[PDB]
Amino acid sequence: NADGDFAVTHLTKAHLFHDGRVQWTPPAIYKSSCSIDVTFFPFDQQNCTMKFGSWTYDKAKIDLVNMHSRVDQLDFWESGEWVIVDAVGTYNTRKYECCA
């Protein structure tokens, strides 16, 4: 995060099913930092990333699953300035000095 919120703040309603499934799809505006390479500007290609994860639950308590590798663009409002070439999520694990 960079100049924005860390977590979701809108808190829409969740959709609860009878077998215990919970579906929650809130909107969010994120301002994330990404290093910008302008070697070939204005013919440049930028590669900006977004890292999401649980803050206080480790892998033994909460684990993430890719709903689908590619970012969904069925409802995407075209910008007119940039075109998305590729948007894919990668699953990672790792240890921090904070926590065991």
């Binding site: 799809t25 639950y57 709903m67 663009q73 948007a87």
Partner: protein
């Protein structure tokens, strides 16, 4: 008989002994699998 009344009964039962601060697993060794995905509405700005 109306769907609203049945939903009211269901809401009364579901949250009777519910704790929103506790991880929702039957067994402590269980893990909560969260299916996570992104859907982009628009690309507001690349500063």
């Amino acid at each position: 008989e109306t769907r609203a009344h049945a939903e009211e009964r269901l809401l009364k039962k579901l949250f009777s002994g519910y704790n929103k601060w506790s991880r929702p697993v039957a067994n402590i060794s269980d893990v909560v699998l969260v299916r996570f995905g992104l859907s982009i509405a628009q690309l507001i700005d690349v500063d």
